[PDB]
Write an enzyme that holds these catalytic residues in place. Structure first.
Site, mmCIF file in Angstrom:
data_model
loop_
_atom_site.group_PDB
_atom_site.id
_atom_site.type_symbol
_atom_site.label_atom_id
_atom_site.label_comp_id
_atom_site.label_asym_id
_atom_site.label_seq_id
_atom_site.Cartn_x
_atom_site.Cartn_y
_atom_site.Cartn_z
ATOM 1 N N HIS A 1 37.064 15.144 1.798
ATOM 2 C CA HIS A 1 36.509 13.858 1.930
ATOM 3 C C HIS A 1 35.245 14.245 1.231
ATOM 4 C CE1 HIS A 1 39.217 11.716 3.976
ATOM 5 N NE2 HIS A 1 40.062 12.517 4.091
ATOM 6 N N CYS B 1 34.583 7.946 -2.237
ATOM 7 C CA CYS B 1 34.960 8.119 -3.739
ATOM 8 C C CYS B 1 36.328 9.349 -3.035
ATOM 9 C CB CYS B 1 34.077 8.806 -4.800
ATOM 10 S SG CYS B 1 34.362 9.613 -6.238
ATOM 11 N N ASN C 1 36.633 18.550 5.003
ATOM 12 C CA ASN C 1 38.304 17.858 5.163
ATOM 13 C C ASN C 1 38.519 17.146 3.944
ATOM 14 O OD1 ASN C 1 37.714 17.087 8.152
ATOM 15 N ND2 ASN C 1 39.401 18.365 7.756
#
Ligand SMILES: Cc1cc(C)nc(N)c1
Ligand SMILES: Cc1cc(C)nc(N)c1
Lengths: 269, 268
Positions: free
Chosen positions: B192, B227, B190
């Site tokens: 991330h 992050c 995804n």
């Protein structure tokens, strides 16, 4: 995994993991390259190589010799999806005194279809001086034990892409990713940077729009000098081209010394 | 891998790969954390969760909700060697309206001995606003389907290390690794940053001499903010002592905290 009936090649099946896939839920090319290295390592263990991370023969250990990668070339027709099983077959061949080659064929375990192929060239080096050398008669004799004696090539074609010379990218590059550095996860058990890390660093300078709209079909990567644990690398890319082609260069940030050069071919989804 | 006979936990065996091991030819703690995530994903698929990378229930999809990690705690007694087979058993539990927990036990497949254990806490978040929220009755009902109803804890003991509060490291740090940034291999499907990347970044500021002379026994990591793909992170560490360290990850520019943690190491 196991050696085949004739003992001249090795096969292993892998189930693609959740963290090994990209945005299209299929294995990344770095996952494929890690699986190629893992099956190569299992094959070397099965035919009696040292189990210390250096994969050396008995003659190589006596003479303080190691193999270093000179080129990796991968062509993928279909990337396996998350949860799919991929079967990889690998084998080696001696190329006289020049060096050795390791080849791979990837298949969809359910259909039996070939989904990819790869080839790599390795050259001999003294482990202490880091100086290259030719392959000796004793080492060629050791390879005869477990390699097919008639040629067996993953890339048989006449003037195929896997042997093409790669030119040096000229400044200014079209795209760049600066200040790349390895972390401990990028090192192998002997504290050298893993070969697959350099594929990741090459791809970092491909724009995200190409990655989102295209599939990587072919990657060819020459290796010239190792990145050390304390080195910093810049990744440079320039478009050379329904297909998009790029020319790549990795060089040290602090003096511009080349460490790798390569090309990639991408097809629009 | 498979659900167990009672359908309330899941087990999977892994053969440790050549590239998964460190200098002592045993699995790194990042390899262990990747295997814990993989068996967690296989368990979620086996009990009917989303196969899109978000591991959501039917009620969660309707309400645009996702789980985010709040803490990971891992204790390793023996790291498996290259070529060894490790069996990992995992299960989940609801913790009322607070959130949920996923626990793991690691065993040596040949001996059957417990070689490690882990626990993680997850909190609910709206996927669009990134705002936290309590777990609803409908979601707690969905967890009752596949979770043990009597408590089952990998770290049962009252006031154990896995629930300890972690303080904030004070400047100046004793050690640091600055300018860390994720590459595509650090992202999940995804896009991330993978939870395991933050464990790697924490460990980057431990001196190489500690890594060479000690084995990591315990790591506890709080997650506070993600992050992003374009962010740059500084990893800070101070000795608090066995050797014990206090850790902090913050964004390189503005100093915003993203994680804090502690590690405990035993001399080889
Ligand atoms: C092909 C090659 C040559 C040298 C001197 N070093 C490498 N690492 C690879
Ligand atoms: C525990 C927590 C809280 C928030 C706001 N974001 C996270 N990523 C994790």
């Amino acid at each position: 995994g196991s050696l085949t009936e004739d003992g001249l090649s090795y096969k292993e099946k892998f189930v693609v993991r959740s963290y090994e896939v990209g945005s299209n839920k299929t294995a990344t090319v770095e996952t494929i390259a890690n699986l190629l290295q893992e099956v190569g390592c299992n094959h070397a263990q099965s035919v009696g190589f040292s189990t210390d991370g250096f994969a050396t023969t008995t003659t190589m250990r006596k003479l303080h010799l190691i193999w270093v990668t000179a080129r990796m070339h991968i062509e993928i027709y279909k990337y396996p999806a998350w949860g799919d099983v991929v079967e990889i077959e690998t084998w080696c061949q001696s190329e006289g005194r020049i060096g050795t080659r390791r080849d791979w064929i990837l298949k969809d375990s359910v259909t039996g279809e070939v989904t990819g192929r790869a080839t790599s060239k390795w050259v001999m080096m003294n482990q202490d001086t880091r100086r290259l050398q030719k392959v000796s008669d004793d080492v060629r004799d050791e390879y005869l034990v477990f390699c097919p004696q008639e040629p067996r090539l993953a890339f048989p074609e006449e003037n195929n892409r896997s042997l093409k010379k790669i030119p040096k990218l000229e400044d200014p590059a079209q795209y760049s990713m600066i200040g790349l550095k390895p972390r401990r996860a990028d090192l192998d058990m002997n504290q050298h940077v893993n070969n697959v890390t350099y594929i990741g660093w090459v791809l970092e300078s491909i724009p995200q729009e190409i990655v989102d709209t295209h599939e990587l079909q072919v990657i060819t990567l020459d290796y010239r000098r190792e990145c050390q644990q304390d080195d910093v690398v810049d990744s440079l890319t320039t478009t050379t081209s329904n297909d998009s082609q790029f020319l790549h260069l990795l060089r040290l940030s602090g003096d511009g010394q080349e460490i790798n050069r390569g090309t990639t071919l991408w097809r629009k989804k």
